[PDB]
Amino acid sequence: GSRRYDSRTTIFSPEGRLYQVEYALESISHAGTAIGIMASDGIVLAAERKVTSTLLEQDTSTEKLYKLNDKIAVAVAGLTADAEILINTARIHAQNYLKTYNEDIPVEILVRRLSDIKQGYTQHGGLRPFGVSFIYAGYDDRYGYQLYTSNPSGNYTGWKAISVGANTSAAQTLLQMDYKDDMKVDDAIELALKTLSKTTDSSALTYDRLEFATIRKGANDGEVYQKIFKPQEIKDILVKTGIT
Amino acid sequence: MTDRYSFSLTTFSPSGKLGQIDYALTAVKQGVTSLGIKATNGVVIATEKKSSSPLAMSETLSKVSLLTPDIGAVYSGMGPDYRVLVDKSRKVAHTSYKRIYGEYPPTKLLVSEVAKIMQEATQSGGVRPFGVSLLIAGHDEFNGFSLYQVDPSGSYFPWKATAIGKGSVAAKTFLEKRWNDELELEDAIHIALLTLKESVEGEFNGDTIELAIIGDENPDLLGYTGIPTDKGPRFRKLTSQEINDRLEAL
Amino acid sequence: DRGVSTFSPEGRLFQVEYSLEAIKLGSTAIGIATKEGVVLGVEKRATSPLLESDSIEKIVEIDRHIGCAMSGLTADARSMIEHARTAAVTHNLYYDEDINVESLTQSVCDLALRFGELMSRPFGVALLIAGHDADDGYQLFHAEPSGTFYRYNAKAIGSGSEGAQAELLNEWHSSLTLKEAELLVLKILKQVMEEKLDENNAQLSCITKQDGFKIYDNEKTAELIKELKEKEAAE
Amino acid sequence: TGYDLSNSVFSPDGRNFQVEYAVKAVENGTTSIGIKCNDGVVFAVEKLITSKLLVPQKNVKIQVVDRHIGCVYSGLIPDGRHLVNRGREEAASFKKLYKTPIPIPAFADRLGQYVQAHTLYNSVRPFGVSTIFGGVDKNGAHLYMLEPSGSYWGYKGAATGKGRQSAKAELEKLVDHHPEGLSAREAVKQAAKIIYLAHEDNKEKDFELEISWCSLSETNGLHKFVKGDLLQEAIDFAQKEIN
Amino acid sequence: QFNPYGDNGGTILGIAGEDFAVLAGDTRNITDYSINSRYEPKVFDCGDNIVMSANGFAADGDALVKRFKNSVKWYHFDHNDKKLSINSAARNIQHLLYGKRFFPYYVHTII
Amino acid sequence: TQQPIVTGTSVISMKYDNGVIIAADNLGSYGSLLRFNGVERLIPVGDNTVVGISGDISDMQHIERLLKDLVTENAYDNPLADAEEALEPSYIFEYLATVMYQRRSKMNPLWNAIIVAGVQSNGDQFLRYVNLLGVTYSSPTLATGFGAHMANPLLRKVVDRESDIPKTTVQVAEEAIVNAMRVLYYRDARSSRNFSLAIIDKNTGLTFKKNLQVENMKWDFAKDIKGYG
Amino acid sequence: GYDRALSIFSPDGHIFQVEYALEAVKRGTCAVGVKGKNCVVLGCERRSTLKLQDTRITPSKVSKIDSHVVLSFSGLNADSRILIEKARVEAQSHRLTLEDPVTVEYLTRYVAGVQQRYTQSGGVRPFGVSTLIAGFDPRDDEPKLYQTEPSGIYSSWSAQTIGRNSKTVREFLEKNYDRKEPPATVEECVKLTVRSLLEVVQTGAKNIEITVVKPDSDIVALSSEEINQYVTQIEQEKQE
Amino acid sequence: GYDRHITIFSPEGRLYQVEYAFKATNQTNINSLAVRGKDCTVVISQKKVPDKLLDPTTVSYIFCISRTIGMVVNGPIPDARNAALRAKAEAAEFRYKYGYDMPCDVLAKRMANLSQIYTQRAYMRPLGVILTFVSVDEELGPSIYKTDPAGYYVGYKATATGPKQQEITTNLENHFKKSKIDHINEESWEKVVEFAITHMIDALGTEFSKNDLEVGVATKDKFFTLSAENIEERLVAIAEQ
Amino acid sequence: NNYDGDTVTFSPTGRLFQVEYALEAIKQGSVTVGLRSNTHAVLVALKRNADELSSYQKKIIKCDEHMGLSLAGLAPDARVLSNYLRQQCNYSSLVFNRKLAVERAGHLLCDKAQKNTQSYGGRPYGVGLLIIGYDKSGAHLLEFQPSGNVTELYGTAIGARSQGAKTYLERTLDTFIKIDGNPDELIKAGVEAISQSLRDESLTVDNLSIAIVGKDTPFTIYDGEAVAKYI
């Protein structure tokens, strides 16, 4: 019958590894690099679009950076379509929490929920896992500014600075070298762009090949503002930091 | 009986490739060329009516389809897959939007819904991916004119102009040289006809070419008068005669 | 691959035959039925000295009049025990009486072949079910993952079974006392065990009409081990 | 290759090999026939006597559906019983909704669609039987034969099983020599002869003859088994022709 | 409105001796002021030396007896032809009756 | 739960020495309107059983179809369908009684009162009753509706107990049944003059009599009756 | 629904999916449990391949199931969350119905049961997780320490370790842990737990986590400096 | 190589099971033809009764789907009858739900959609048939719409299906190249049937008796099939000029 | 070979190997004999033990007062099929007040077994059954195969070495069919029949199992000292 054609997506290898998870991670290693850096006064999200065209409408385009709510955003590395399925689920989860408790969802609770959904696809159902890794940038009044990552296994971890996608080994070494604990957002913006500029597979880093976002308490007084950078604003910050 | 294929037929290979999606893209590559160009005051989508037999009435086969009064779609790849996607796209525009908000969806969100359907055929049990790439052109009040490509994976990207299928690589290069941000709709149609001629072997006329635009509101195609705010559809399919008129000024 | 419910060319179910191999790797369990009671004994087989051996539970009460010993993949036995306890209690609720030992055993064995593509595989554990009822007296059954159960005067299961069964062949007679059966289980367990038998790595139990099912204290078993040593040195 | 390992898979020829393998099981079975007469139909089957311990006349093979349809089959007997059970459900639901007993062509399609459905999926096996069936309805007599593929047609005469070639040749002679038609009583006699003649392909063991019929004049359009004197008369006629 | 219950009259009596027991009942079956039958047995031998009567609404009475007789049959199948003791039969009948707690057998049962 | 619309009145029956007799009129009432005048309410099953039905006619036609399907089903893979494994009166009754009790237990009854009359394989007389409640009983005489109140008293004068059955001939039994049908025509407002009668005898088999009429009626004394006091 | 039997027997009587789940446990970071006379200590390894980690928010290796019971693990991190959630729900369900918190043995038996179920249910794979469950029964001062594994078997331990290089630290514990006289104080128990991890860990910096559980719901996690003082004192005695 | 057993993509982006279903289509070795008149639509198909034991009246590949719609099938009879039953059910349901007769082109699309699903869903196999639907539509007039195992469909001026479809197709192409119109300019359906038979004789190079052919005719408000004697009258008229 | 992985696959010669493998399990089973006259029907079964400490596996199961069977093959499958027969006998009695005909019981067993031979996921039954009974048409004996094939016979045998008993019954056919009104002589004929299938071992008191049903005889099983009379 049908058993003949079943790939068995949720089995261990003899070494105790999940085949499909490992292969999904291999897929993600070819995706455009995304970087997150956490500072004392905010968080930076920087990401590289994959080999674009001059006829691509950039100002209406979004493939890397997505808003989950007013306090939490994600950077994507992997299959964009897979990511949008999970993103919509996360947006709903945040609203469910807000309706139930009348408070914005704490960052970790949202991250744990999405990570559990990824985990399920590795243990039951016989379906392929989501070929997506996320960087979560968010703020809540318990832990303040937070960075997390999750991958197709459904495992998640917290970070001061982190990269996903292509050339993460090189990127992480560069971040580990220049990152300091008392760093500020404007310094973190520079570090993120410098790291992408060195790790990129492209000839040069330009505005049309980037997506950029900040989460700042640089919102007038006791509140947090998300800023998804426009193409012209990415062009300006590239000049300011002296990359173009 | 019962569908006993509850497992994924698309899976990651050791190299990280999703084979069935790659193979679906190969089917799209074999398909007839279709293109889209965005102007300041409109969008044009076009393709060749590759008739399978001269006894066949190719007017009864619609490659360019109205999704909403302000949104149209064209494809390259497997025709039957396209036809059912058009049926699903038309319905989801109503069920997940118009029956909720009392208005037709914006282009980007309808594209998002079609993309979701195509993504699910890439992960759900006992199904293969859709063997088509779509080009969706549309207009809405707050986003203006837009053009999107949707691939078998479910990924979608916005374009100023693009081409898919057989001679897409050559066609995209042709479009890069001609496109600017000051094009009027008639200029975009002219460029569309020029671009499409390169990938067509045989007859090149209004009967072998299918072309539609997203442009001005057409009150003559509304079917009723009396409501000022209702001004008619922006989607319009060009006639055989209208295409031939522009082939003399070619 | 191949069906989970597939027959071999010899007319045997592959999965059932393979589960029998898992039971052969299990620790030894022995049962002896007498007219004064049924004795159940097991090898604990702790994997390390830091493992607190009294937490190893391979002899289990099903009801006051029915006990059970296990060998093989012992985690698989938990749902079987749960079902047995539920079946014993349910029958008492429905009929205001004790359930027959055979009927309890049959109920457990009905679970065995409920696998396919129900559970995904057969149980990887064998059970020795011992008990007493008014109709058939003291009884000992051997429940297998094939769904088959045989009644026995004496039976050994696990890794040292065929050597133990040959020993039980010679030693059992219809006039054995309870004390004689206790020493006999200890003697044969000591014979087949890798490590030296003591009160911490072996466990005894019995079922009598008067007192019901009882797991023996380590102090009580230790005395029976000392009694065994002296009587073997007596000739 | 591997196209023949799973049902519903098209081979590069455009063939369903699993259905063709089901036909092999049919060809391995005993001979069964059907004859369309002037106002009805006759069914007959060869029953191999494997041993003396078989109780004569007890292991009945021909099956009735409703009260006006007879069914006989060659191949895997259980598969045939499963098909007749379904046929009985189909006939019951038809009569429940429409009052009138199911017409023979209508009944033929009900069996046909059900057998065809078992060639659509790999989760089921095709039927290992060819079924000869028919009876009398408002438009007269009808005889059908249905194959493992779900294919069926109407017949003047039909045969299946191990001795089908022999039987077919005999049936073809009757069609040629009787363009005006055959009577019901003649058809019973001829059916006995043809089974006896077809038994040469199964000559190792001896057999038992079983005949049934539906006729407008002889049985009032109801399916009945041929018994006693009429059966013996047909056996005698058959034995006389082989000698 | 449809009334699923009725009253078929009848009176039954059970007495326990030192080493015997009797279960008696009249044979008259009625509805309202009419006689349905002058002889319609109401007390039944259910096997295993048990007699039973379920008096009141006869349809429920016949159903309960029929189900209990069946329970005796299956007790033998399931428990090696063990004799069903009167106490075990009583507990079993409680479960048959309480199984329809919210749509009762409209009878008074005696064994 | 429903209400009966088109209805049939009394069904009466009794045992005699060699068999049973059953009868019922040919009317289908629509309340007080005597709507349908050609309704057969005695339904034979084989040559050994007759089922007599009163109450809702639509439910009667349903039961008629169940019985027809029962005969079809019994003949399936049954070489002895017209012999040892033919349907018995007791089989047909128990089936109907099962259906009737199940339907009342779902609170959706078949609004009928049924009497199954027949002769068993061993020659024993069979006569038993079942209704919309699933209530069953047997007696030397059985009757439904008005017949229970007016026919039974007359029929019980012939067969008052079990020992009277061997003493009762078929001529005496038929005579009593026919008289009771006349009495019901005098006194039941939902009755008709036309009726059917069936005899099931262990020797002569099933005799089914249609288009019978109530005759020898007394009305002449009416001419002398004047006023109300 | 997806019903495929993934955990099945092989000709030699092995269930490979369950055995491969144990290989995932072997890969996981080392976890250790030691019970003293009046306490239990859970030690955990943190691999220093990941720096730039935010330790405030990163999932900690030891998880409270209730106020009196804790759970640590070795193996797949994502898998462990599912077991931890189920255990926490069951702990509250037990309090709701029995009106008493779970015993350590009951909680262990439940988690072990879930693990077993996932070895003979259709369409699911076994958990790639082994757990150490420690605490004190309500109104009881006797220390409790249990272990579970993918197959679903469980048992009580005076001291135990799981995960990578657990063979080495078990070697240490088997020669250093005396049953007649267990670590009499919190100090002695923590010292022996840190010593056991130092056989395997690398640097005694942010690589060792220590959680102490005492009777009556007294659970506290030691900080970097507190652990660092144990690390310092151990090696200064070793230089001799 | 399990990509050849079920309907998933091969490395070339092909569906082999669909391609093999097209091959099953010619298993009956029968050719069919359809043409349009002014007021009618005619469909003819070869009839072969190879066994003398067969009842020839029951051997047919033309189906009356609804009062207005007819369907001829190229492929094995089990799959043909499967498609026939479904088309009949769909046509009846359509009329019930939407209050008017299902158009020929709409039924074709519906059956084409069902076929598409079998090419995408693994558990269902394609039907090894090509379906040619004919009618005189109340809006579009004479109509021919044809469906295949790929889920493809289109309208036709005229069409042919079977092992020798190309010969018939080219013959029809050449006629319409002369006349320069999309139909047979003839008043009566009888003469449109005569045209259809004549051009099949020319294309195949074979003569036909009354039992060698099978004819279906669609007019306004009804589709019907011709008897052997009706076909004989058609053959006599062809021979007499 | 390539066609024996499941029950849903025909071989190129039209064989069903999983069904044939299920048939093989019966041949490994212990011998059991069935035979009948016009008044009675008898089952004789050789029970098999595991070893000298073990009991002898029971072979005969009662289905109703007038019907029962003997088994050879997978015992749990016999329990499933006999349970189904118990239910069907019971349905007939409760609903129709009718004892289930033995021939109809055979038809029901055939259809239940057939469903397991045509569907994916399942497996055929691995047991053979000999059903005896006395109904309205007298004594009956049936042989059930898990292929679905059910056959009515005067006598038969299934299990290991069953061919010896079957040949004996084929010789004795004219004699044992005439043993009317004499239960002991009919059992003797059955005990003599099963003896033609023994090697090395002989019929002992805990080895032999006998069942009988007849005109005025409910289905009863004899074991232990109750069969010493026939040894």
Ligand SMILES: [Cl-]
């Ligand atoms: Cl559709």
Ligand SMILES: [Mg+2]
């Ligand atoms: Mg498919």
